[PDB]
Design an enzyme around this catalytic site. Structure first.
Site, PDB file in Angstrom:
ATOM      1  N   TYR A 215       7.492  -2.316  -0.462  1.00 46.99           N
ATOM      2  CA  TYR A 215       7.941  -2.731  -1.800  1.00 46.99           C
ATOM      3  C   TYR A 215       8.462  -4.164  -1.792  1.00 46.99           C
ATOM      4  CZ  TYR A 215       7.374   2.028  -3.470  1.00 46.99           C
ATOM      5  OH  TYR A 215       6.860   3.248  -3.846  1.00 46.99           O
TER       6      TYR A 215
ATOM      7  N   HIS B  56      13.971   2.479  -4.173  1.00 47.15           N
ATOM      8  CA  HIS B  56      14.137   3.952  -4.212  1.00 47.15           C
ATOM      9  C   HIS B  56      15.504   4.362  -3.648  1.00 47.15           C
ATOM     10  CE1 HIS B  56       9.502   4.722  -4.479  1.00 47.15           C
ATOM     11  NE2 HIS B  56       9.981   4.075  -5.543  1.00 47.15           N
TER      12      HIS B  56
ATOM     13  N   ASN C 144       8.767  -2.838  -8.951  1.00 50.77           N
ATOM     14  CA  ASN C 144       8.266  -2.287 -10.207  1.00 50.77           C
ATOM     15  C   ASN C 144       8.468  -3.263 -11.345  1.00 50.77           C
ATOM     16  OD1 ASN C 144       7.377   0.189  -9.097  1.00 50.77           O
ATOM     17  ND2 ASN C 144       9.485   1.016  -9.175  1.00 50.77           N
TER      18      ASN C 144
HETATM   19  C1  LIG Z   1       5.305  10.371  -9.358  1.00 52.57           C
HETATM   20  C2  LIG Z   1       6.706   9.903  -9.609  1.00 52.57           C
HETATM   21  O1  LIG Z   1       7.295   9.943 -10.703  1.00 52.57           O
HETATM   22  N1  LIG Z   1       7.294   9.446  -8.508  1.00 52.57           N
HETATM   23  C3  LIG Z   1       8.554   8.711  -8.497  1.00 52.57           C
HETATM   24  C4  LIG Z   1       8.439   7.470  -7.606  1.00 52.57           C
HETATM   25  O2  LIG Z   1       7.384   6.748  -8.192  1.00 52.57           O
HETATM   26  C5  LIG Z   1       6.447   6.372  -7.197  1.00 52.57           C
HETATM   27  O3  LIG Z   1       6.819   5.264  -6.389  1.00 52.57           O
HETATM   28  C6  LIG Z   1       6.241   3.961  -6.470  1.00 52.57           C
HETATM   29  C7  LIG Z   1       7.052   2.850  -7.162  1.00 52.57           C
HETATM   30  O4  LIG Z   1       6.465   1.767  -7.326  1.00 52.57           O
HETATM   31  O5  LIG Z   1       8.254   3.020  -7.471  1.00 52.57           O
HETATM   32  C8  LIG Z   1       4.770   4.072  -6.863  1.00 52.57           C
HETATM   33  O6  LIG Z   1       4.234   3.502  -5.053  1.00 52.57           O
HETATM   34  C9  LIG Z   1       3.031   2.796  -5.253  1.00 52.57           C
HETATM   35  O7  LIG Z   1       2.023   3.759  -5.489  1.00 52.57           O
HETATM   36  C10 LIG Z   1       0.728   3.162  -5.762  1.00 52.57           C
HETATM   37  C11 LIG Z   1      -0.259   4.260  -5.995  1.00 52.57           C
HETATM   38  O8  LIG Z   1       0.217   4.954  -7.044  1.00 52.57           O
HETATM   39  C12 LIG Z   1       0.326   2.358  -4.516  1.00 52.57           C
HETATM   40  O9  LIG Z   1       0.107   3.240  -3.361  1.00 52.57           O
HETATM   41  S1  LIG Z   1      -1.360   3.220  -2.665  1.00 52.57           S
HETATM   42  O10 LIG Z   1      -2.233   3.876  -3.606  1.00 52.57           O
HETATM   43  O11 LIG Z   1      -1.141   3.916  -1.329  1.00 52.57           O
HETATM   44  O12 LIG Z   1      -1.845   1.789  -2.567  1.00 52.57           O
HETATM   45  C13 LIG Z   1       1.364   1.348  -4.130  1.00 52.57           C
HETATM   46  O13 LIG Z   1       0.987   0.736  -2.867  1.00 52.57           O
HETATM   47  C14 LIG Z   1       1.090  -0.704  -2.846  1.00 52.57           C
HETATM   48  O14 LIG Z   1       0.095  -1.124  -3.744  1.00 52.57           O
HETATM   49  C15 LIG Z   1      -0.103  -2.507  -3.798  1.00 52.57           C
HETATM   50  C16 LIG Z   1      -0.633  -3.007  -5.065  1.00 52.57           C
HETATM   51  O15 LIG Z   1      -1.243  -2.167  -5.787  1.00 52.57           O
HETATM   52  O16 LIG Z   1      -0.411  -4.213  -5.352  1.00 52.57           O
HETATM   53  C17 LIG Z   1       0.196  -3.244  -2.737  1.00 52.57           C
HETATM   54  C18 LIG Z   1       0.753  -2.718  -1.406  1.00 52.57           C
HETATM   55  O17 LIG Z   1      -0.060  -3.170  -0.310  1.00 52.57           O
HETATM   56  C19 LIG Z   1       0.765  -1.202  -1.447  1.00 52.57           C
HETATM   57  O18 LIG Z   1       1.773  -0.738  -0.517  1.00 52.57           O
HETATM   58  C20 LIG Z   1       2.684   2.079  -3.949  1.00 52.57           C
HETATM   59  N2  LIG Z   1       3.644   1.085  -3.515  1.00 52.57           N
HETATM   60  C21 LIG Z   1       4.230   1.040  -2.284  1.00 52.57           C
HETATM   61  C22 LIG Z   1       4.935  -0.188  -1.922  1.00 52.57           C
HETATM   62  O19 LIG Z   1       4.026   1.969  -1.479  1.00 52.57           O
HETATM   63  C23 LIG Z   1       4.286   5.521  -6.933  1.00 52.57           C
HETATM   64  O20 LIG Z   1       2.995   5.660  -7.278  1.00 52.57           O
HETATM   65  C24 LIG Z   1       5.158   6.219  -7.973  1.00 52.57           C
HETATM   66  O21 LIG Z   1       4.599   7.501  -8.027  1.00 52.57           O
HETATM   67  C25 LIG Z   1       9.717   6.676  -7.594  1.00 52.57           C
HETATM   68  O22 LIG Z   1       9.931   6.141  -8.905  1.00 52.57           O
HETATM   69  S2  LIG Z   1      10.925   4.895  -9.174  1.00 52.57           S
HETATM   70  O23 LIG Z   1      10.310   4.052 -10.115  1.00 52.57           O
HETATM   71  O24 LIG Z   1      12.358   5.342  -9.729  1.00 52.57           O
HETATM   72  O25 LIG Z   1      11.193   4.172  -7.960  1.00 52.57           O
HETATM   73  C26 LIG Z   1      10.812   7.660  -7.147  1.00 52.57           C
HETATM   74  C27 LIG Z   1      12.134   7.006  -6.790  1.00 52.57           C
HETATM   75  O26 LIG Z   1      13.172   7.921  -6.490  1.00 52.57           O
HETATM   76  O27 LIG Z   1      10.921   8.717  -8.146  1.00 52.57           O
HETATM   77  C28 LIG Z   1       9.787   9.585  -8.205  1.00 52.57           C
HETATM   78  O28 LIG Z   1       9.914  10.516  -9.278  1.00 52.57           O
HETATM   79 NA    NA Z   2      15.244   7.604  -2.508  1.00 50.14          NA
END
Ligand SMILES: CC(=O)N[C@@H]1[C@@H](O[C@@H]2O[C@H](C(=O)O)[C@@H](O[C@@H]3O[C@H](CO)[C@H](OS(=O)(=O)O)[C@H](O[C@@H]4OC(C(=O)O)=C[C@H](O)[C@H]4O)[C@H]3NC(C)=O)[C@H](O)[C@H]2O)[C@@H](OS(=O)(=O)O)[C@@H](CO)O[C@H]1O
Ligand code: NA
Length: 754
Positions: A239, A230, A180
């Site tokens: 990630y 996470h 992130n």
């Molecule tokens: C909704 C909410 O508040 N949830 C949180 C949670 O946040 C979620 O987690 C991640 C993050 O980055 O921390 C973020 O995952 C990424 O989501 C996007 C789509 O929104 C992509 O998924 S995809 O649509 O399936 O592609 C992304 O995928 C990756 O994208 C890319 C790229 O765009 O460059 C490349 C990779 O090939 C692909 O995997 C996806 N990332 C991964 C690696 O899966 C979520 O959208 C966000 O909702 C966490 O928040 S945190 O910031 O504290 O970590 C969680 C932790 O406990 O807390 C929840 O409340």
């Molecule tokens: Na977790």
């Protein structure tokens, strides 16, 4: 740095993201990359909302849905990429340009502007849109007006005033970490190129430094090479790859400029290429066990993520010292060459194509994956290799969640941390060919499982719950590893099991003990659950064959071994009945991911299991897997006491490997396994060579200050290699006392002399 420097940086970014300066004329792979670029662009143009007073840009994407808002912007940035790529169908096309500009303008007015409060997923507003809108600004810099740059920069800055932080004000802003932090800093750096803002650019570059500092808890890179995002999920493969990708692109962009990343500790990130990423790369795919909820994604697979990692490593290699560049290139040439299943050039971008062609022009030879063991105790993962196979074990513990589900993804993955045994082989599609759409999520390979049905999202989303177990951990000496997991089942069933794995250069011995549950349901242990694709692969036994008819489970006769055509051998190390099922399974990706297609995939499986029955009291199992073994070698596994079970109970589990003259053990309680004792939880591997005893030891709870072994193979009077204090107990046996304070599950290697 002024106008000329910012123009050079923007030009460099456009070169990087289009490959416009490195297209080889008449090259069939470049042509194919351009064709894929053209088809995606044409698809997006076909979906443009042309209506007067439109409230969306694309007819199939609502701006009121934050994911569809992101896709609106990524389609616009793709179109801008195509418009900027020589020989693309829309290259320099003014009508296309006008449509892109109007799309950016209306998406701003309608939705993504400096007066809008976030609604829905924070990532959409802070990472999804900024990266794409920033790219689009840079691609279109010669075409957008100053007022348009002002408006779009203002929008980005409204949602991301500081990329060192994340979340909208109403939530409370926290430090951004890991992937992130990289993604937020990327969006701001590219936006700072468009707006010529050195202050924001410098602060975003400085924000990169945190992501490669070693951690001992939370998210980041651990000194053992683990990578967590996470808090509770092993995450190198998804990630971690996002982090790797973003840093590759930003390091390359900025190198040699006023803004170059100059923090010397970035060596930790370069060390992570081989320390973190390479061991979990298997013939071009990131291991499923380190990619969390992404297993549920039909079009974000282990091969998609491995291909991104290869691109990134190749890009980084251009700036490294010669030996490291060549090593990384050899590694990548091997991951490319061995992957005939999803060749990296199929649907590759122009930049990816160019890096792969540049690699092939260096003549650097393919490097094989090294045999042996790579342990990651901070994330409860191990990797093991021998000729033709890679075993990836997926554990869980009081530090590591059973699974991550979230955003409608992987809600059924609750057994994926129950001791899975992924045997990767020359069947490159094993875990990729609709495995996660069709597999039995209650019979995943290797696990012990209470057959009580569990709801989707059991234990909560985001890895919020972890099993309150005694320990999970591992050690290894030379060719042999010892891995243990106290499994506590998800869903409050009361399932408990003591699972260990003893892994040599060829065979994996799987021991289970102390199995019971509180639910009243049957408990199983899965020897394998193996995708046969559309095959009818024969299951050979001493007597003939077994499970020749799909859907009728059979029990193995008395020979104790089964060979699966195209895989290898399995053998029972106790007298427990082995159930063998050939089955046909169906499912759609929509069944495992809210974004998955509705297409129904149908796959054949071989499913081998032990049934511990209802109300097991101290249930147990003992079996082995021999990937790549012929029928003849499989028939011989149980002969000659090659794999000698020593103990298998609630105190300790242990096996001796006869050929390797090496013994492996896990200890649950103080006690003895054979002639080896331990004072508390331990993983141990030992081997005597004449008058010298070699040992590997870990303290797998990560919480004990000391550990004392009672030494096997007679008495020992000095320490040749390593640390530890020799002693003698009341009974004349030699002891070795180790200070294990703060060792975080890591292995101590010791050599003693008689
Ligand atoms: C909704 C909410 O508040 N949830 C949180 C949670 O946040 C979620 O987690 C991640 C993050 O980055 O921390 C973020 O995952 C990424 O989501 C996007 C789509 O929104 C992509 O998924 S995809 O649509 O399936 O592609 C992304 O995928 C990756 O994208 C890319 C790229 O765009 O460059 C490349 C990779 O090939 C692909 O995997 C996806 N990332 C991964 C690696 O899966 C979520 O959208 C966000 O909702 C966490 O928040 S945190 O910031 O504290 O970590 C969680 C932790 O406990 O807390 C929840 O409340
Ligand atoms: Na977790």
């Amino acid at each position: 740095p002024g106008a000329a420097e910012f123009a050079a940086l923007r030009n460099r970014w456009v070169d990087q993201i289009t490959g416009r300066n490195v297209i080889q004329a008449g090259d069939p792979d470049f042509a194919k990359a351009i064709t894929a670029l053209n088809n995606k662009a044409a698809d997006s143009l076909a979906k443009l909302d042309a209506a007067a007073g439109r409230t969306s840009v694309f007819t199939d994407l609502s701006l009121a849905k934050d994911a569809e808002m992101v896709t609106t912007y990524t389609r616009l940035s793709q179109l801008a990429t195509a418009w900027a790529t020589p020989t693309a169908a829309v290259f320099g096309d003014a009508a296309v340009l006008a449509a892109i500009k109007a799309g950016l303008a209306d998406a701003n007015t309608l939705c993504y502007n400096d007066r809008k409060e976030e609604v829905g997923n924070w990532w959409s507003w802070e990472i999804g849109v900024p990266r794409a809108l920033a790219d689009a600004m840079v691609l279109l810099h010669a075409e957008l007006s100053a007022a348009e740059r002002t408006a779009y920069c203002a929008a980005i800055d409204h949602f991301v005033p500081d990329p060192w932080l994340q979340f909208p004000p109403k939530r409370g802003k926290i430090t951004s970490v890991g992937a992130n932090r990289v993604d937020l800093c990327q969006g701001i750096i590219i936006r700072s190129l468009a707006g010529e803002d050195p202050t924001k650019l410098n602060h975003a570059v400085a924000g990169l430094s945190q992501v490669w500092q070693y951690v001992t808890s939370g998210d980041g890179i651990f000194r053992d090479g683990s990578f967590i995002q996470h808090s509770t999920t092993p995450y190198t493969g998804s990630y971690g790859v996002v982090l790797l990708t973003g840093l590759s692109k930003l390091f390359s962009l900025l190198g040699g400029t006023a803004f170059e990343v100059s923090d010397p500790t970035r060596s930790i990130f370069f060390d992570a290429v081989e320390g973190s990423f390479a061991p979990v790369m298997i013939n071009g795919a990131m291991a499923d066990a380190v990619r969390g909820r992404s297993i549920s994604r039909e079009a974000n697979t282990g091969y998609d993520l491995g291909a991104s990692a290869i691109e990134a490593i190749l890009l980084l290699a251009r700036a490294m010292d010669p030996a490291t560049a060549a090593r990384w290139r050899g590694l990548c040439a091997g991951w490319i060459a061995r992957d005939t299943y999803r060749p990296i050039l199929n649907s590759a971008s122009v930049p990816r194509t160019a890096l792969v062609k540049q690699l092939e022009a260096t003549g650097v030879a393919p490097v094989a994956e090294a045999t042996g063991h790579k342990l990651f105790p901070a994330m409860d993962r191990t990797m093991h290799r021998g000729p033709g196979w890679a075993l990836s074990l997926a554990l869980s513990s009081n530090r590591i969640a059973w699974y991550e589900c979230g955003n409608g993804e992987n809600n059924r993955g609750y057994h994926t941390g129950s001791g899975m045994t992924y045997f990767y082989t020359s069947d490159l599609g094993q875990y990729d060919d609709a495995f996660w759409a069709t597999a039995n999520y209650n019979r995943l390979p290797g696990i012990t499982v209470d057959t009580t049905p569990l709801p989707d999202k059991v234990e909560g989303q985001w890895g919020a719950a972890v099993p309150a177990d005694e320990w999970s951990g591992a050690t290894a000496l030379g060719e042999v590893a010892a891995v243990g997991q106290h499994l506590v089942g998800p869903g409050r069933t009361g399932l408990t099991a003591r699972k260990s794995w003893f892994v040599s250069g060829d065979v994996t011995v799987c021991l289970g003990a102390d199995i019971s549950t509180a639910s009243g349901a049957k408990v199983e242990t899965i020897v394998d659950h193996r995708n046969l694709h559309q095959g009818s692969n024969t299951l050979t036994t001493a007597a003939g064959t077994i499970a020749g008819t799909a859907g009728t489970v059979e029990v193995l006769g008395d020979g104790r071994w089964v060979h699966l055509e195209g895989f290898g051998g399995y053998a029972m190390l106790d007298d427990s009945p082995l159930h063998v099922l050939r089955e046909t399974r169906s499912g759609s990706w929509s069944g495992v991911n809210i974004n998955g297609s509705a297409t129904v995939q149908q796959r054949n499986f071989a499913t081998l299991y032990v049934n511990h029955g209802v109300g097991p009291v101290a249930g147990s199992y003992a079996y082995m897997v021999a990937p790549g073994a012929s029928v003849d070698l499989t028939r011989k596994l149980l002969e000659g006491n090659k794999y000698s079970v020593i103990r298998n109970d609630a105190t300790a589990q242990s096996v001796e490997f006869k050929t390797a003259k090496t013994t492996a053990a896990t200890f649950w309680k103080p006690g003895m396994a054979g002639d080896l004792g331990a004072s508390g939880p331990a993983c141990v591997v030992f081997s005597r060579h004449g008058n010298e005893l070699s040992l590997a030891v870990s303290e797998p709870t990560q919480k004990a200050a000391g550990l004392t072994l009672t030494l096997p193979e007679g008495t020992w009077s000095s320490v040749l290699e390593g640390a530890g204090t020799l002693g003698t107990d009341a009974d004349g046996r030699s002891t070795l006392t180790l200070d294990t304070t703060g060792l975080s599950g890591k292995t101590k290697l010791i050599k003693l002399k008689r």
